[PDB]
Design a binder for this molecule. Structure first.
Ligand SMILES: *[C@@H]1O[C@H](CO)[C@@H](O[C@@H]2O[C@H](CO)[C@@H](O[C@@H]3O[C@H](CO[C@H]4O[C@H](CO)[C@@H](O)[C@H](O[C@H]5O[C@H](CO)[C@@H](O)[C@H](O)[C@@H]5O[C@H]5O[C@H](CO)[C@@H](O)[C@H](O)[C@@H]5O)[C@@H]4O)[C@@H](O)[C@H](O[C@H]4O[C@H](CO)[C@@H](O)[C@H](O)[C@@H]4O[C@H]4O[C@H](CO)[C@@H](O)[C@H](O)[C@@H]4O)[C@@H]3O)[C@H](O)[C@H]2NC(C)=O)[C@H](O)[C@H]1NC(C)=O
Ligand SMILES: COc1ncccc1-c1cc(Cl)c(C)cc1OCc1n[nH]c(=O)n1C
Ligand SMILES: [Ca+2]
Ligand SMILES: [Cl-]
Ligand code: NA
Ligand code: NA
Ligand SMILES: [Zn+2]
Length: 805
């Protein structure tokens, strides 16, 4: 109950929310049924519209009007935004030349440039070029300021997950808003876009920007606008707050538009009907910039123009139905549309079986337009698993499609022509970023980046210390003219051992054999130097990775490769090798087919053993440095060391062998040499972070050899591919992957074919950032380069997407 008969006189859009059952005059009151009786009359004035006209200039103040053209309006801070244009012969901001903003030019009393976040729903990245003729204000921001060709959203590419990621710097699995709809079984409560539970604070984790600012003594305006407040009134309210006294005035503000998303759903991303919502958004931008210019703030405020996600063509006839696959459709609940999430209709049914649901959905029709996953098997780049609100069973839906439970669900709800929510690497889901102001660079283009990075930068723009988040702070320093954050490299926690020859062959009883006793001063001194690190400058181009946790490991040098060997996990944590453009692929010789050789630098007690693999009928093994790429018949023996072996399901070895035998050489030819770092990942609790030894759920049968959940590779070369990877003077180029270590290839519907028709497709799906691998391994790469650390941070956040242009 709200005693809604107090008054909003003098309180309109008050910044603090007052205590119930007293009535509220803040923006949110509309959303909560809680506004005072006179809110509309006082706070949502509309008389005479939003623009000054020649006849209103100098008019007698009339407090009924939406905005004012009276002589006193500037000092009252409540002029219509085109006041100076219509009445004082001023130009619109969009008609002025741009001029570099080298320093903030702010009114007396401003302690820091304010930040205004102008957020637009469904603003697909290509609108910037395609709609440029109808968006002159936006185009001036973009061309004069700092812009990316696009910004990558988070998955699922829906409004609530993305805006709350913008606010917090966190992945949806960590902030808790994992979809536009949700069930939380600890709460036993549901979350819906329309409705009231969504306002309960227990949905919303992390620490959003407005809370970060408030805790650190910086005041914040409204971020969440009640839907029925018109855009013009949102703009005027921001401008009025900017005229408050210094002690009362917020330093951070947000505007939000539900367009162009609302129209895109109805008409498709490029429907002829889309031109008008883009003109209208541009007009709102012009209103803000004219308002800033009147307040003399237009060379003082930093403005961020940002989208939450794009928009794809999607119609009702592109709907797959679970009822075409499942006979038990009534025992399940599906969250439908551009992704699928499945759980049991009833937790009292112990015959509900996730395993047979998945199998019933897997490669069942020849052009099937979605793919089922246990959430832990989703591409690690999605970071979409470590939350009780994400259902164990997930469906990744093809772009342009929907999934629904039953046909009745689609027609008892064709209306829509657009939708979004798909995989965040899809081109149509990409959105926009422009930064304009004294703290941003002038006429500068930056490479695409992920929206999880913006929270750090907004904190930098406001002099705030960010709460812990998933951005990599410093990776966006190149956007900024000043206020950069000067990150330092994390310190190494464990230093390596450098073991020499310490064991005789007969001390090993690992059940391994190798046909290797096949018998010189020229090349006995030569191979001693190789074991000592003579070729390490070739194979370890960017320094050794730092180990950032406490552990016991050895560095092992070889002619063709260097590794960091873990005495705890009995395998390398990383293996580094460089393949030049000229390098040759050879085969594994016959007499060496099943060869595994004890490593006399490493004790039997810290080694894997072959018997375990023999005994384990499901588990085979592979090698981190591929024998196929050995530099000489004699160097090839190093590749069969027991210290280069890792456990691999036979199904996975099909993938790995193809990568090693074909793809590495292909990349080396195309990129002019590559450096490769490969290794295992253990993420049994699917949190995106390295497992400790006591978290491992699977071992090679009868042994202490832990089984990786994934295998990674980081492939680095020169960005200027006229220089070979091992002799690169300038910026680097990288691509990486984190391949799931699975006992079948059910994920790949064409796997019964030759690896050349499916393997590279699978690796592309599992593309990764170097940063994703760092989290999963506790390693820190690129420690010794000639590049600035900010540049290296940007390189480590790069994702190679395999989308076209
Ligand atoms: C992306 O960035 C984020 C932020 O940096 C990273 O997430 C952090 O990960 C840390 C490690 O996993 C984690 O640290 C833990 O904190 C626990 C205290 O947690 C509360 O307080 C924080 C801080 O204010 C708060 O943010 C948390 O909020 C979570 O919980 C509620 C749900 O109830 C949500 O509203 C909210 O959205 C958020 O949920 C998310 O995180 C939790 C994990 O905390 C997940 O379970 C959810 O699915 C969701 O994603 C909390 O309210 C603390 O309890 C932990 O301590 C244990 O582990 C330490 C190791 O130091 C051990 O020594 C201790 O003994 C302790 O173990 C004891 O408890 C165990 C579990 O009950 C028990 O098994 C043992 O036997 C012991 O008795 C731990 O330090 C931190 O909370 C999150 N922060 C956030 C915001 O998510 C994330 O890792 C990054 N991702 C990537 C890929 O890099
Ligand atoms: C789902 O976003 C939110 N949820 C809860 C708190 C705040 C935000 C939020 C956060 C940011 Cl960073 C921005 C830039 C806009 C936001 O909300 C805008 C909004 N107003 N009205 C409406 O419907 N939306 C989505
Ligand atoms: Ca883990
Ligand atoms: Cl959703
Ligand atoms: Na075996
Ligand atoms: Na298959
Ligand atoms: Zn939408």
């Amino acid at each position: 109950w709200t005693a809604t008969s107090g008054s909003c006189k003098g309180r309109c859009f008050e910044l603090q929310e007052v205590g119930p059952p007293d009535c509220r005059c803040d923006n949110l009151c509309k959303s909560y049924s809680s506004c005072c009786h006179d809110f509309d009359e006082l706070c949502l004035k509309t008389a005479r519209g939003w623009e000054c006209t020649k006849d209103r200039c100098g008019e007698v103040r009339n407090e009924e009007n939406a905005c004012h053209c009276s002589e006193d309006c500037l000092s009252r801070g409540d002029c219509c935004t085109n006041y100076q244009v219509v009445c004082k012969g001023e130009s619109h901001w969009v008609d002025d030349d741009c001029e570099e903003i080298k320093v903030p030019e702010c009114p007396a009393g401003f302690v820091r440039p304010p930040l205004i976040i102008f957020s637009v729903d469904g603003f697909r990245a290509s609108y910037m070029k395609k709609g440029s003729k109808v968006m002159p204000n936006i185009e001036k921001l973009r061309s004069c300021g700092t812009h990316a060709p696009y910004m990558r959203p988070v998955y699922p590419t829906k409004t609530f997950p993305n805006l709350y990621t913008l606010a917090t710097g966190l992945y949806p699995e960590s902030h808790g808003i994992v979809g536009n709809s949700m069930y939380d079984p600890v709460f036993d409560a549901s979350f819906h876009l329309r409705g009231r539970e969504k306002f309960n604070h227990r949905w919303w984790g992390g620490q959003p920007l407005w809370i970060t600012a408030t805790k650190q003594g910086v005041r914040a305006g409204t971020f969440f606008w009640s839907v029925s407040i018109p855009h013009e009134r949102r703009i005027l309210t921001i401008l009025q707050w900017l005229s408050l006294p210094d002690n009362e005035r917020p330093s951070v503000y947000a505007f939000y538009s539900e367009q162009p998303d609302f129209s895109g759903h109805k008409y498709g991303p490029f429907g002829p009907e889309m031109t008008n919502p883009l003109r209208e958004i541009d007009k709102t931008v012009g209103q803000l910039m004219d308002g800033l210019k009147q307040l003399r703030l237009h060379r003082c405020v930093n403005v961020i123009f940002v989208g939450d996600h794009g928009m794809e063509d999607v119609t009702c006839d592109r709907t797959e139905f679970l009822s075409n696959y499942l006979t038990n459709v009534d025992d399940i609940t599906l969250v439908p549309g551009t992704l699928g999430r499945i759980r049991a209709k009833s937790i009292n049914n112990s015959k509900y079986d996730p395993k047979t649901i998945i199998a019933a959905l897997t490669c069942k029709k020849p052009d099937q337009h979605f793919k089922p996953y246990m959430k832990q098997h989703l591409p690690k780049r999605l970071h979409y698993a470590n939350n009780r609100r994400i259902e164990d069973i997930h469906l990744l839906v093809d772009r342009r499609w929907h999934v629904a439970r039953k046909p009745l669900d689609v027609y008892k709800k064709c209306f829509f022509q657009g939708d979004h929510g798909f995989d965040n690497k899809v081109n149509s889901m990409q959105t926009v970023f422009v930064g304009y102001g004294p703290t941003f660079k002038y006429r500068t283009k930056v490479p695409p980046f992920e929206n999880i990075e913006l929270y750090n930068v907004m904190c930098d723009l406001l002099g705030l210390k960010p709460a812990p988040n998933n951005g990599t702070h410093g990776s966006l320093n190149h956007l900024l003219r000043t206020n950069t954050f000067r990150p330092t490299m994390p310190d190494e926690v464990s230093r390596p051992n450098y073991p020499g020859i310490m064991y005789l062959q007969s001390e090993f009883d690992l059940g391994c054999t190798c046909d290797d006793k096949v018998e010189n001063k020229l090349e006995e001194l030569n191979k001693r130097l190789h074991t000592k690190g003579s070729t390490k400058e070739r194979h370890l181009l960017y320094g050794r990775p730092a180990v950032l946790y406490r552990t016991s490991y050895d560095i092992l040098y070889h002619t063709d490769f260097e590794s960091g060997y873990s005495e705890i996990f009995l395998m390398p944590l990383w293996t580094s090798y460089t393949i030049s453009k000229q390098a040759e692929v050879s085969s594994i010789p016959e007499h060496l087919t099943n060869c595994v050789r004890p490593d006399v630098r490493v004790s039997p007690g810290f080694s894997q053993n072959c018997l375990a693999y023999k005994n384990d009928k499901q588990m085979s093994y592979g090698f981190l440095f591929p024998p196929y790429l050995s530099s000489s018949p004699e160097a090839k023996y190093d590749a069969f060391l027991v210290t280069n072996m890792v456990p691999m399901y036979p199904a996975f070895k099909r993938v790995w062998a193809y990568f090693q035998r074909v793809l590495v050489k292909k990349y080396a030819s195309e990129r002019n040499g590559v450096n490769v770092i490969s290794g295992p990942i253990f993420d049994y609790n699917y949190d995106g972070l390295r497992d400790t030894e006591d978290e491992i759920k699977q071992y090679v049968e009868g042994s202490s050899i832990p089984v990786p959940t994934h295998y990674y590779s980081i492939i680095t070369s020169c960005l200027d591919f006229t220089q070979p990877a091992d002799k690169c003077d300038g910026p680097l180029s990288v691509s990486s992957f984190i391949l799931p270590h699975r006992p079948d290839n059910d994920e790949s519907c064409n796997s019964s074919e030759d690896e050349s028709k499916w393997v590279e497709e699978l690796m592309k799906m599992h593309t990764a950032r170097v940063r994703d691998i760092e989290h999963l391994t506790g390693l820190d790469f690129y420690r010794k380069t000639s590049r600035s650390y900010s540049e290296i941070l940007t390189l480590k956040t790069y994702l190679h997407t395999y989308e076209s242009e």
